[PDB]
Amino acid sequence: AIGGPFSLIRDDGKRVTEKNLMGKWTILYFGFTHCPDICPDELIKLAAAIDKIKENSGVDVVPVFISVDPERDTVQQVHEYVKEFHPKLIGLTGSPEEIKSVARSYRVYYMKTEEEDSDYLVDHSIVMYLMSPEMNFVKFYGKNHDVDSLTDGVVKEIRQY
Ligand SMILES: [Cu+]
């Protein structure tokens, strides 16, 4: 299946693995803090989806932001960024090699794009992964989903699992 072991650094400075995410339903979003529109929109969608899922099903789903820009996105940078969207949003970062291993595992494309206004941007896969409480992949959610189609979907999966 899509995913596998990782050793990353959480927004609090603690070193984590896939085992630190176990025990709760999880949604993983790969992004970068310097993203102008895509990532802020997707996370806003995710944060509002987290709350709607809870209201409708009673299930606490943990949103997870994984950085595809480790050169700029430090622990302090990721921490400050994640706190803006939802109080329950975990931020994961690491070494460019650590990030390479986890993106590979999740089949995520990421490539630095030179920019004049930004120093550069990271071109990447606009993806969400609904992992279960035993960290096994359940469903994928693309850019085309709205808060309602994400909520409805996640809620449908949880009940059938
Ligand atoms: Cu982005």
Describe this structure in words.
- This protein has helices spanning 38-57, 75-82, 96-105, 147-160, and strands spanning 7-10, 15-17, 25-31, 61-67, 90-93, 110-114, 120-124, 128-131, 137-141.
- It has one domain (1-161): Glutaredoxin, CATH 3.40.30.10.
- With 161 residues, it is α+β, with helices and mostly antiparallel strands.
- The strands form two sheets. The protein has a seven-stranded mixed sheet. Strands 6-7 form a two-stranded antiparallel ribbon.
- The two termini are 16 Å apart.
Give descriptors for this structure.
161 residues, 4 helices, two-stranded antiparallel sheet, binds copper (I) ion, globular, 9 strands, Glutaredoxin, seven-stranded mixed sheet, alpha+beta
Q: Strands, helices and their partners?
A:
Elements: E1 7-10, E2 15-17, E3 25-31, H1 38-57, E4 61-67, H2 75-82, E5 90-93, H3 96-105, E6 110-114, E7 120-124, E8 128-131, E9 137-141, H4 147-160
Parallel strand pairs: 3-4, 4-5
Antiparallel strand pairs: 1-2, 1-5, 3-8, 6-7, 8-9
Helix pairs in contact: 1-4
This protein binds copper (I) ion.
